[PDB]
Amino acid sequence: RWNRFCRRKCRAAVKSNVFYWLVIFLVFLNTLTIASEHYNQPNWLTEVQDTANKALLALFTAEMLLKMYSLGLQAYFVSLFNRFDCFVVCGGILETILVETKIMSPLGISVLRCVRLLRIFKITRYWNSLSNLVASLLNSVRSIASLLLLLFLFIIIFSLLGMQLFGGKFNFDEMQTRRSTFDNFPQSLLTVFQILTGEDWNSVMYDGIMAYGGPSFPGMLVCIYFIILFICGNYILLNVFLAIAVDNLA
Amino acid sequence: SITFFRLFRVMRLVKLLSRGEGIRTLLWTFIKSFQALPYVALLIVMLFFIYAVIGMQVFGKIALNDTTEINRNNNFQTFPQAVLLLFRCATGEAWQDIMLACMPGKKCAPESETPCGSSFAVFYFISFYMLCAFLIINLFVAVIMDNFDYLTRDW
Amino acid sequence: RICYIHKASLPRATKTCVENTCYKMFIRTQREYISERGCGCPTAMWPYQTECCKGDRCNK
Amino acid sequence: ISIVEWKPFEIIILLTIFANCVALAIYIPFPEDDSNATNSNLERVEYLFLIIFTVEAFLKVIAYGLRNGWNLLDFIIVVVGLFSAILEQATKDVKALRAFRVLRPLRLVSGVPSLQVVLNSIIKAMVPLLHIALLVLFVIIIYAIIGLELFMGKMHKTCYNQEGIADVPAEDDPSPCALETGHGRQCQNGTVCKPGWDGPKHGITNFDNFAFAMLTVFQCITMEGWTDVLYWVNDAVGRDWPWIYFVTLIIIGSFFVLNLVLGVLSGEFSKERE
Amino acid sequence: KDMLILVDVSGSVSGLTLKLIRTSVSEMLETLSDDDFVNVASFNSNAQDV
Amino acid sequence: TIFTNLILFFILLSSISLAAEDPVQHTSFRNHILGNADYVFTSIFTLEIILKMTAYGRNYFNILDLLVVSVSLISFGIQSSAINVVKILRVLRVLRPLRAINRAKGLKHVVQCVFVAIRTIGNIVIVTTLLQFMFACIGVQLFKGKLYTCSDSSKQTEAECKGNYITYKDGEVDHPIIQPRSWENSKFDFDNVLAAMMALFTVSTFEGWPELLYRSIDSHTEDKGPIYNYRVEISIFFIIYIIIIAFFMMNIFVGFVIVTFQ
Ligand SMILES: CC(C)CCC[C@@H](C)[C@H]1CC[C@H]2[C@@H]3CC=C4C[C@@H](O)CC[C@]4(C)[C@H]3CC[C@]12C
Ligand SMILES: CC(C)CCC[C@@H](C)[C@H]1CC[C@H]2[C@@H]3CC=C4C[C@@H](O)CC[C@]4(C)[C@H]3CC[C@]12C
Ligand SMILES: *[C@@H]1O[C@H](CO)[C@@H](O)[C@H](O)[C@H]1NC(C)=O
Ligand SMILES: [Ca+2]
Ligand SMILES: [Ca+2]
């Protein structure tokens, strides 16, 4: 009833140029604070980068509200990028429960706030294609998820068959304990993922051949598994990660 | 001599391969597209030349120690061998290991009169990889879009 | 008290110090060649690793 | 009985296949016949998980008269399951028949409409990439044959530490050598080296038959370890002409092959988009 | 003492584990004087004496 | 186009002269035939400027020509400190081939096409490097100093990992060999942001990443040794990084190039 000094300095103060251009400065400060850390840090850096965390979080949490009753709740929550900062601040004020027993440590959520550094990118050339980029990648998210789920099912099937064939057979008298095995399901999944990306796909094949006897007629027939895995996995990788890219980007 | 002359029969085999309308159409179109653009290969050639000379002068003086990733086969000690090393890095085999082997403090050849090596290895073996990837992708896309008219035809 | 500190790892020039811990900065793989001795227990960049001692010229 | 084939049966069967998949996920293999209690319970559960499929398959045949495709696949996995159960119970073969448990999730995935559609799209996109699958088959043949002519068994010598036959004592990486009058890697200081050696990598990687050289060419085409083979054929035959093989195979069979695949796929994608 | 060594010879100890098991047992029998009695058994779902 | 031929021959022949040198040796006959080879080239290369300078009074590629000829003009002298400055101008002789880019038409066309491609894909490159920085920052607070290990697996502290220990050849108990005990960090660590920026690049190149995965899996505490399969849920970091950066942001690069050229 008496907002004759509230709304005038609500919309015309959060969108009043300097507010932005200084929020960008504070975002750069936050990313500097989280980035400027290493192993065996000095005492002063550990103190300052721990003090400044909440010193910036309080200002940004206030900025939440200052922009909230300026554009209302509907116009605040409609924007997808607004909800990203919403989740960032929610996690920031939430991490002071699990800070008791580390778990997430200083959770890498303070990083994810640099997506609000693309605010500077906003005015850059063809930023209204980057918004279009994520727009398409989220509009076709159903097809993207279906393709990814089919690829994941292919990986799961070739991991189950992998652990059925070479389960508990990579146990030779040699001293080392090579970790590209098929013992558990996580290990089989990691091995299948490693073979699918090509990296050292010929080093697990040799183990598979040497485990199933050796170079021979029936023994050297299990390379068919690795060959089919490589061919089909690369083909599906192309059909997913290039169809998504080409379709959405075009 | 004799080993060379036993080989021709695989050419009759490749003629048998050439049999087929689709194979001939695809292959002839792609070869004519590749010949249509000979100035896109003289970018990768230039890149290989420049980085071979640069690496030869900077990082190639080390002794051929068989226990590291520089030996009688992998070294900068001659232009063909340097080109082979760059090709191996372009295919991405052990480029990080060669970068580590080019780190400074490696004993160099006694015939040359442990201060040998350089810290330029990171920049060289990262910039070469990125630039080679870009140039190969540019060649690929150029030859693809020169034949795009054939590629999408609705026979 | 005395351990040689320098920027260029090759010449290995001598510089004074005050910390009672002389370190040893070497590469993670080629550890035979010592890049930089000195004083204090600093942080090693890549590719490097540091071993820190209890006295002067302990690094050897 | 062709009235219970409605929704409840479908969702129930999908849940059964999903539970079978998770059961296979837990199963965990053990070296040389060992087993814990979980493997002694999952083998009991994968009897109800077989009775359910047997009951499902018994009604459909006397309800729908096997040619639906995925129905045929379900039938094969079911009959293999009963045969496996009978053999396991009567023999106290395990390796052979526990493999069809990965065909089972295929029958799972062929229940959801918008995953069958995606697979149909993928298979439809695979059809144009058949000439560029024939030309990749007729390169690993032309070069395998050439490798047969050039490097037939030339990589079977290695340093042996002259003082007794011993067993290939030369670093922790046995590498081929030569006979000085040859052109390979001389063991130089003593260590005269003689034939009778399995191979560079336990005998799996070498140009001996049309099988071990139709796999060595494939590895050098996927570019994962072609330098290791180049060095092995280099310091066993010489360093003059082993590169005109291993570089002309990758600038003809791994770039001009990855170029056509990308071109055809991009073309098909553009056509489908139009 | 009256040591009695039980050795797990089930399937899961095949490979590196058996090599260290066969060496560790060989090096605890060497901590025994002539005043001590020792036997070695093994179980693989059936107890026995090796 | 005679003079243009008169050069496109000489510059390329000078390039092949500077290519077939003697890397390892500083004194030889190949680097003396090619040591005094560049006196016919250097004067005729300089004379081109003299003939062309008085025809005008400056465009862009002429600056490159001036620099590539001044490289020889200066490296002939210099003297004094013959341990540096000569050692960088020796490398700076890699700009002779680039002189041919201007005196050969079509080469400018393809170079300009590549530079406009840079202009188109700078956005994707910047996004990829920003995500690299982001993932490095997350990984720092995840593997900060936990990737240390000792040569002896029975010690899990830098203080304890000292002195000597016994190593057995090929797992044979009858061949013991004394080795020292060394607290060695991983080849690709995560101690700071910059180191993670290189480790993640090597991961995205699909080279040596299984070793990093199976080393980070065994990490439990800072400044301590590894534990076999202590955490297997940490593989999700690498899986997500490979899916998002090594697959999505590279195929998006390729698709951008393809759709732009189409
Ligand atoms: C990968 C799937 C989709 C298709 C390929 C089937 C694979 C897994 C099959 C086809 C041929 C099979 C081999 C045929 C013969 C033998 C010899 C025997 O003494 C051990 C099993 C072994 C070595 C089989 C292992 C599994 C095998 C390699
Ligand atoms: C994975 C998909 C294709 C279904 C599973 C098919 C494959 C993996 C299965 C089906 C038939 C199986 C074979 C049938 C019989 C035997 C004989 C036995 O002495 C060794 C295993 C061996 C050789 C089996 C290996 C695995 C096998 C080839
Ligand atoms: C160089 O080779 C010698 C002899 O093989 C070896 O003792 C030494 O450790 C090697 N040094 C390096 C840095 O590889
Ligand atoms: Ca590789
Ligand atoms: Ca057991």
Swiss-Prot record, chain A:
Q: Which residues lie within the membrane without crossing it?
A: 187-208
- II repeat positions in this chain? 3-249
- Lineage, top-rank taxon, reads Eukaryota
Q: In which tissues is it expressed?
A: Detected throughout the brain, including hippocampus, cerebellum and amygdala, throughout the heart and vascular system, including ductus arteriosus, in urinary bladder, and in retina and sclera in the eye. Expressed in brain, heart, jejunum, ovary, pancreatic beta-cells and vascular smooth muscle. Overall expression is reduced in atherosclerotic vascular smooth muscle.
Query: Which of this chain's residues are annotated to bind Ca(2+)?
Result: 199
Q: How is it modified after translation?
A: Elevated levels of blood glucose lead to increased phosphorylation by PKA.
Q: Which stretch carries the motif Selectivity filter of repeat II?
A: 197-200
**Cytoplasmic compartment spans:** 69-79, 128-146
Signal sequence annotation: none
Residue ranges in the Extracellular topological domain are: 37-47, 100-108, 167-186, 209-218
Q: Write out the transmembrane intervals.
A: 18-36, 48-68, 80-99, 109-127, 147-166, 219-238
According to the UniProt entry, the note on domains is: Each of the four internal repeats contains five hydrophobic transmembrane segments (S1, S2, S3, S5, S6) and one positively charged transmembrane segment (S4). S4 segments probably represent the voltage-sensor and are characterized by a series of positively charged amino acids at every third position.
Q: What's the family?
A: Belongs to the calcium channel alpha-1 subunit (TC 1.A.1.11) family. CACNA1C subfamily.
Q: What is this protein called?
A: Voltage-dependent L-type calcium channel subunit alpha-1C
UniProtKB/Swiss-Prot annotation, chain B:
Where's it found, cell-wise? Cell membrane; Cell membrane, Sarcolemma; Perikaryon; Postsynaptic density membrane
Highest taxon, organism lineage: Eukaryota
Find motif (Selectivity filter of repeat IV) and give its ranges: 91-94
Q: In which tissues is it expressed?
A: Detected throughout the brain, including hippocampus, cerebellum and amygdala, throughout the heart and vascular system, including ductus arteriosus, in urinary bladder, and in retina and sclera in the eye. Expressed in brain, heart, jejunum, ovary, pancreatic beta-cells and vascular smooth muscle. Overall expression is reduced in atherosclerotic vascular smooth muscle.
Extracellular topological domain ranges are: 60-81, 101-120
Residues the record annotates as the site (Calcium ion selectivity and permeability) are: 93
Q: Which residues are noted as glycosylation sites?
A: 65
Question: Where is the region Dihydropyridine binding?
Answer: 107-155
Give the Cytoplasmic compartment stretches of this protein: 21-38
The ranges of region (Phenylalkylamine binding) come to: 114-155
Q: How is it modified after translation?
A: Elevated levels of blood glucose lead to increased phosphorylation by PKA.
Show intramembrane residue spans. Answer: 82-100
Q: Where does the sequence pass through the membrane?
A: 2-20, 39-59, 121-145
Q: Where are the disulfide bridges?
A: 108-116
Q: What is known of its domains?
A: Each of the four internal repeats contains five hydrophobic transmembrane segments (S1, S2, S3, S5, S6) and one positively charged transmembrane segment (S4). S4 segments probably represent the voltage-sensor and are characterized by a series of positively charged amino acids at every third position.
Q: Which family does it belong to?
A: Belongs to the calcium channel alpha-1 subunit (TC 1.A.1.11) family. CACNA1C subfamily.
Under which name does UniProt file this protein?
Voltage-dependent L-type calcium channel subunit alpha-1C
Organism of provenance: Homo sapiens (Human)
Q: In the UniProt record, what gene is named as encoding this protein?
A: CACNA1C
Of the parent protein, the shown chain spans 1372 to 1534 of 2221
Swiss-Prot record, chain C:
Q: Which UniProt keywords apply?
A: Calcium channel impairing toxin, Cardiotoxin, Disulfide bond, Ion channel impairing toxin, Secreted, Toxin, Voltage-gated calcium channel impairing toxin
Cystine pairs annotated here are 3-22, 17-39, 41-52, 53-58
Q: Where in the cell is it found?
A: Secreted
List, in alphabetical order, the Gene Ontology terms for molecular function in this entry: calcium channel regulator activity; toxin activity
Q: Where is this region: Important for binding to L-type calcium channels?
A: 41-48
| Misc remark | The sensitivity is higher in cells of the cardiovascular system. Neuronal, and insulinoma cells L-type calcium channel are more resistant. A total resistance is found in skeletal muscle cells.
Per the similarity annotation, which family is this?
Answer: Belongs to the three-finger toxin family. Short-chain subfamily. L-type calcium blocker sub-subfamily.
Q: What is this protein called?
A: Calciseptin
> What species does this protein belong to?
Dendroaspis polylepis polylepis (Black mamba)
Which taxonomic lineage does the organism of this UniProt entry have? Eukaryota, Metazoa, Chordata, Craniata, Vertebrata
Swiss-Prot record, chain E:
Q: Which residues bind a divalent metal cation?
A: 8, 10, 12
Name where it's found: Membrane; Cell membrane
Q: Hey, what tissues is this thing expressed in?
A: Isoform 1 is expressed in skeletal muscle. Isoform 2 is expressed in the central nervous system. Isoform 2, isoform 4 and isoform 5 are expressed in neuroblastoma cells. Isoform 3, isoform 4 and isoform 5 are expressed in the aorta.
* Taxonomy, superkingdom: Eukaryota
Q: How is it modified after translation?
A: Proteolytically processed into subunits alpha-2-1 and delta-1 that are disulfide-linked.
Motif span (MIDAS-like motif)?
8-12
Disease note: Developmental and epileptic encephalopathy 110: A form of epileptic encephalopathy, a heterogeneous group of early-onset epilepsies characterized by refractory seizures, neurodevelopmental impairment, and poor prognosis. Development is normal prior to seizure onset, after which cognitive and motor delays become apparent. DEE110 is an autosomal recessive form characterized by profound global developmental delay and hypotonia apparent in infancy followed by onset of seizures in the first months or years of life.
For this chain, the family text in UniProt reads:
Belongs to the calcium channel subunit alpha-2/delta family.
Describe the subunit structure. Answer: Dimer formed of alpha-2-1 and delta-1 chains; disulfide-linked. Voltage-dependent calcium channels are multisubunit complexes, consisting of alpha-1 (CACNA1), alpha-2 (CACNA2D), beta (CACNB) and delta (CACNA2D) subunits in a 1:1:1:1 ratio.
Miscellaneous comment as given in the Swiss-Prot or TrEMBL entry: Binds gabapentin, an antiepileptic drug.
What organism does this protein naturally occur in? Homo sapiens
Q: Which gene encodes it?
A: CACNA2D1
